[PDB]
Design a protein around this ligand. Structure first.
Ligand code: 6OU
Ligand code: 6OU
Ligand code: EQK
Ligand code: EQK
Lengths: 606, 73, 204, 71
C-alpha cells in the first residue's frame, strides 16, 4: 500500500517528512525499473500521478511537496514521463499537471513545472474540457494558454507565451485557437468585468502578426466572425475599432487615424472580412444570424453603421423604393381587378404584370422559405403571391372561386405593405410597434375574448326556448355568438326579452359577458398595450434598424456581379509599409480628449 | 365580395356605402347585418371580423397607448 | 467539484424537501401569515426542488388535471346545449357526475381546512352545482337547467386556474385577477350607485 | 402588478406542485424523491441536490470539494 500511502500523504501534506519516508521506501524498494517505479507512484485507473494529486489539492505546503516530488523524479531521471503525464479517463483526457496548476491559480507551481519540462502544448482533448452541455464541462480552449487567458491569469499567460515551446497558433479540436476561445468565453461586462478584451489584446500583440486573427475554426469563422456570430459586441467593437500606435505593431490594427487635426479626426477603418464581399462577413453575420438576438448593439459599431448607410444611399434606398412601387402597383392592379370584376392594351399589361410579379415573388419567397420573428413577411408575401397565381389559374378555367382567392390576395397584399414601412424611421418604428402590439397584446386578447364569446354564446343559447316564429336573437349558438360580438362592438340594440325560460339568469349571464368584455377585457387591453408601447419604444429604433439592414443586405444580394463591384463601399488606402487594404474613412469630432496626435498617414488634414 | 341584387339587399354594395358601413361600425353606430348578399359569406365575415379586430381591438387602443406616451413626454 | 467558472454544489435537503412534516419548501410555499414568500422561493435549494418536482411529475399531473377539467367542462357545455327542449354519451354524463363528486369532496375537505383560495371556493361551488343539477334532473325538476348552465359558466371561469401552467398565461391571469379586484369591483360599485340613483331619479 | 406577477405566478404554480405531490401515493412519492444521497463529510451522507453554476468575477484557488475531478 506504499502507493496509496504516498497518494494520501501527498494529497494531504501533513508534513514533508511523511512523503520523504514513503519516497525513500519506494526508492529502496523498486531498485530490487522506471516503468514500475511509476506504476508504484501512479493511479493505474485514471493515470493520475502524485504530482497531479498534489496539485489537485493545494495545501499551504504544496510548493515544497511537488518540489521534492520532481527532485526525486529527476534523481531517478524519470522527470520526462513524470511531470508530463496525462489523464487516461475519457472525460479528462490529455489533462496534464499544468492544466491543474493553472486552474487552481497556482502561478508558482506552474512556473516551477514548465521550468522543469512541463509540456505546455498539451491539449485537454476531453469531454469535460470540450463540453456539449453547460454545467458539465467548462469551455476555455483546451490548452494551458487558453485556460490561463480565460481564467484571467495574465501572469501565467505572459509566462507561457514567453516560453520558447508554447505554440500560440495551435488549434483545439473545435478548431478554435486562443482567440476564438477568448471570444467564446467572453461573456459581458456585467458577468465578466471585461478582462477578455485585455487578454485578447495582450495575446494578439504578443504574437504580432495576423496568423491568429485569420485562422478559421471548424465552423469556418475567424475570431472576428465568431465575435459577430456569438453576439459579443464588446470584443467585436474592440477588434472592429482596434488602433495600435506602436510603429512595430501598426500592421495588426483594423482602424488607423490618418489626418486628425483638432476636434475633427478622419479614421480609416479596415473592411476586409466586414463588407459582404466575402462568404459570411461581419456585417452579414451581424445583420442576419438570429441565434443570439444580441444584434442590438453590434449594428452601430463604427465601420458597420457606415457600411449600411453607404449601401442604403448608394443603391438600397432606390431598390427599396422601386420594390415598393412595384408592389404598390401590383396591389392596385389586384384591387382594381377585384373591384371591377365582371358581375384592352394597358389593361392586359397590368393583368400579366400581376401574374409575373406573383410568380417572381412566389419563387423568391419560396426559395427564401426553404432556406430557413423576422420571416413572418416571407410567409405572407409567398402566400399572397400564391393566392394571386391560384386565382389566375381558377380564372382561366371556369371557376368562380377565383374571386375568393383574389380578394384574399388583395387583402393580404395591402397587409404586406407593412413591410415597406421600414424605409422610413418614423413609419418603420411605428410598424415594429404595431407588430409587437399584435403579438404581445392583441392575440392574447383575441384568445380570451373568444373563450368568453363562445362560452357565453353557448350558455345564452342554452337558456333559450324554442318558439313556434323568430322571437329570439339568441336562438342558435351562432346567432347568440353573433350578437354577443355585436354587443361588444356596441352595434345593435339590446332586447332582454329573448324567449328565455330563466330570464333573470339570461340577464345575469348577459350582464356578466358585458362586464367581462366591456369593463374588463377591452380596458385591460388598453392598459396592456400601454405597457407594451412603452417598453417597445425603447427598442423600436434598434429593431427597425435591424429590419432595414436585413433589407439592404437582401437587395445587395439581388444585384449582379458587375453592379455589386460597381458599388463596393470603401476606397483602398495606403495603411502600412505594404498593406494597402480596403478601408472606409469616417471623420469624427471630439472635444474632451486633448492630445498631440502622432498617429496619422497624411500629416495634412483635408 | 358582394353580388348584384335585382332591390336594396346589401349595405356593402358599392365601395362608398361599404366604406360608409365600415366607418359606422368603427364609431359604433348602426347595426350589423352579416347577410350582405355576398357570394362568399364566410370570407365576407372573416374580412369584416378582421377589419373589426384591426381597428376596434388594435388601432384605437394602440392610439390610446401612443397618446399616453406622447402626453407624458 | 468546482473548477473554473463552473462549480458544482451539493445543497442539503434534510428538512427542506416535503418529505417531512412542515418542510422549509412546504412552509415557504404555503404559510400565508407573512406575504413575504416573495423572495424565498428562488433560494437555491428550494428553487431547484420545485423545478425538479414540476418536470418529474407535476407538469404531467397538471396537464392531466387540465385535460380532465376541460373534458368535464365540455361535457357540461354539450349537455347544456343539446338538452331536450348511448354508449360514449352516458360515459361522459357519469364522468361529469363522478368528477363533480371528486372535486366536491376534495375542495370541501380543502375548504374546511382553511387571496389564494378563491379557487377552492369556485371549484367547489361549480362541482356542487353540477351534482345538484344531476339530482334535480333525475327527479322531475326543470330548474336543473339553471344549475347546469351556472355550472357550465363557472367551470369555464375556473379554467383561469389552469392558466398557471405557463408563465405567459399565468402572469396574464394574476394580472386579470388583480385588475378584477383592484379596479373592476370598485368600478362596479360606483357604477351601480350611479345607475340606481339615476334610474330612480329619471323614473321619478 | 407587472413587477410582481412573475413572483405571484411562481408562488401559485409552487402551491399547485405541492398540492399534486400530496396526491401521489407513498410509493410514487418515494419513487420521485428529488435529490441523490451524497458523501458529504466523514460520516454524514445526507440527501443532497447538486446545482452546478458559473461565476466569472470571483477568482480564487478552490480548496473546498469532495471530488477533486470535475465531472
Ligand atoms: C397583419 C395585418 C397587419 C395590419 C397592420 C398594417 C399597418 C400598415 C399601415 C399602412 C401600410 C402603408 C405602407 C406605407 C409604405 C411607405 C412607402 C415607403 O416606405 O416607400 C419606400 C421608401 O422610399 P425611400 O427608399 O425612403 O425613398 C427613395 C426615393 N428614391
Ligand atoms: C371570475 C371570472 C374569471 C374570468 C376571467 C378569466 C380570463 C381568461 C381565463 C382563462 C381562459 C382559458 C385558458 C385556459 C388555459 C389552459 C392552459 C393549459 O393548457 O394549461 C395546461 C398546462 O400544461 P403543462 O404541461 O403543465 O405546461 C407546461 C409547459 N411549460
Ligand atoms: C374564462 O371565463 C370564461 N371563459 C369561457 N366561457 C365562460 O362562460 C360561458 C367564462 C366565464 O367566465 N363564465 C362565468 N361564470 C360566472 C358565475 F356566475 F358562475 F360565477 C361568472 C361571473 C359571476 C359573477 N361576477 C363575475 C365578474 C365578471 C364580476 C368577475 N370576475 C363573473 S363568469
Ligand atoms: C355618487 O353619485 C351618485 N350616486 C347615485 N345617484 C346619483 O344621482 C342620482 C349620483 C350623482 O352623482 N348625483 C348627482 N346629482 C348632480 C346635480 F346635478 F344635482 F348636481 C350631479 C352633477 C351636477 C352638475 N355636474 C356634474 C358633473 C357630471 C359635471 C360632475 N362632476 C354632476 S350628480
Amino acid at each position: 500500500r506504499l502507493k496509496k500511502r504516498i497518494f494520501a500523504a501527498v494529497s494531504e501534506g501533513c508534513v514533508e517528512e511523511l512523503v520523504e519516508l514513503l519516497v525513500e521506501l519506494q526508492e529502496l524498494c523498486r531498485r530490487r525499473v522506471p516503468d514500475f517505479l511509476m506504476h508504484k507512484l501512479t493511479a493505474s485507473d485514471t493515470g493520475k500521478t502524485c504530482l497531479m494529486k498534489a496539485l489537485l489539492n493545494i495545501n499551504p505546503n504544496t510548493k515544497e511537496i511537488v518540489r521534492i516530488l520532481l527532485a526525486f523524479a529527476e534523481e531517478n531521471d524519470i522527470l520526462g514521463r513524470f511531470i508530463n503525464a496525462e489523464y487516461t479517463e475519457e472525460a479528462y483526457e490529455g489533462q496534464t499537471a499544468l492544466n491543474i496548476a493553472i486552474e487552481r491559480r497556482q502561478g508558482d507551481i506552474a512556473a516551477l513545472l514548465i521550468a522543469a519540462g512541463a509540456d505546455v502544448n498539451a491539449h485537454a482533448k476531453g469531454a469535460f474540457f470540450n463540453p456539449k452541455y453547460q454545467h458539465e464541462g467548462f469551455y476555455f480552449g483546451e490548452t494551458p494558454l487558453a485556460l490561463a487567458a480565460c481564467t484571467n491569469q495574465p501572469e501565467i499567460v505572459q509566462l507561457l507565451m514567453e516560453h520558447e515551446q508554447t505554440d500560440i497558433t495551435s488549434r483545439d479540436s473545435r478548431g478554435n485557437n486562443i482567440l476564438h476561445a477568448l471570444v467564446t468565453v467572453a461573456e459581458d461586462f456585467k458577468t465578466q468585468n471585461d478582462f477578455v478584451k485585455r487578454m485578447y489584446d495582450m495575446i494578439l500583440l504578443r504574437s504580432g502578426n495576423w496568423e491568429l486573427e485569420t485562422t478559421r475554426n471548424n465552423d469556418g469563422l475567424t475570431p472576428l466572425q465568431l465575435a459577430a456570430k456569438m453576439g459579443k459586441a464588446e470584443i467585436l467593437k474592440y477588434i472592429l475599432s482596434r488602433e495600435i500606435k506602436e510603429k512595430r505593431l501598426r500592421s495588426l490594427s483594423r482602424k488607423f487615424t490618418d489626418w486628425a487635426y483638432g476636434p475633427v479626426s478622419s479614421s480609416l477603418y479596415d473592411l476586409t472580412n466586414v463588407d459582404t464581399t466575402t462568404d459570411n462577413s461581419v456585417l452579414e453575420i451581424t445583420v442576419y444570424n438570429t441565434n443570439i438576438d444580441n444584434r442590438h448593439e453590434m449594428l452601430t459599431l463604427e465601420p458597420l453603421h457606415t457600411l449600411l448607410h453607404m449601401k442604403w444611399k448608394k443603391f438600397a434606398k432606390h431598390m427599396f423604393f422601386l420594390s415598393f412601387c412595384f408592389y404598390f402597383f401590383y396591389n392596385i392592379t389586384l384591387t382594381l381587378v377585384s373591384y371591377y370584376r365582371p358581375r384592352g392594351w394597358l389593361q392586359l399589361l397590368g393583368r400579366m404584370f400581376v401574374l409575373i410579379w406573383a410568380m417572381c415573388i412566389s419563387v423568391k419567397e419560396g426559395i427564401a422559405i426553404f432556406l430557413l420573428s423576422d420571416a413572418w413577411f416571407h410567409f405572407v408575401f409567398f402566400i399572397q403571391a400564391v393566392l394571386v397565381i391560384l386565382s389566375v389559374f381558377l380564372y382561366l378555367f371556369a371557376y368562380k372561386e377565383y374571386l375568393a382567392c383574389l380578394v384574399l390576395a388583395m387583402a393580404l397584399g395591402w397587409a404586406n405593405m407593412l413591410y415597406y414601412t421600414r424605409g422610413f424611421q418614423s413609419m418603420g418604428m411605428y410598424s415594429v410597434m404595431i407588430q409587437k402590439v399584435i403579438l404581445h397584446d392583441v392575440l392574447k386578447f383575441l384568445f380570451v375574448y373568444i373563450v368568453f364569446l363562445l362560452g357565453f354564446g353557448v350558455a345564452l343559447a342554452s337558456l333559450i326556448e324554442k318558439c313556434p316564429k323568430d322571437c329570439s336573437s339568441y336562438g342558435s349558438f351562432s346567432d347568440a355568438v353573433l350578437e354577443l360580438f355585436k354587443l361588444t362592438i356596441g352595434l345593435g340594440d339590446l332586447n332582454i326579452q329573448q324567449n328565455s325560460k330563466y330570464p333573470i339568469l339570461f340577464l345575469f349571464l348577459l350582464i356578466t359577458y358585458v362586464i367581462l368584455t366591456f369593463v374588463l377585457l377591452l380596458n385591460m387591453l388598453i392598459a396592456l398595450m400601454g405597457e407594451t408601447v412603452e417598453n417597445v419604444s425603447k427598442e423600436s429604433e434598434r429593431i427597425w434598424r435591424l429590419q432595414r439592414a436585413r433589407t439592404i443586405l437582401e437587395f445587395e444580394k439581388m444585384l449582379p456581379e458587375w453592379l455589386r463591384s460597381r458599388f463596393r463601399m470603401g476606397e483602398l488606402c495606403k495603411v502600412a509599409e505594404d498593406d494597402f487594404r480596403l478601408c472606409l474613412r469616417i471623420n469624427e469630432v471630439k472635444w474632451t480628449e486633448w492630445k498631440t496626435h502622432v498617429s496619422f498617414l497624411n500629416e495634412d488634414p483635408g
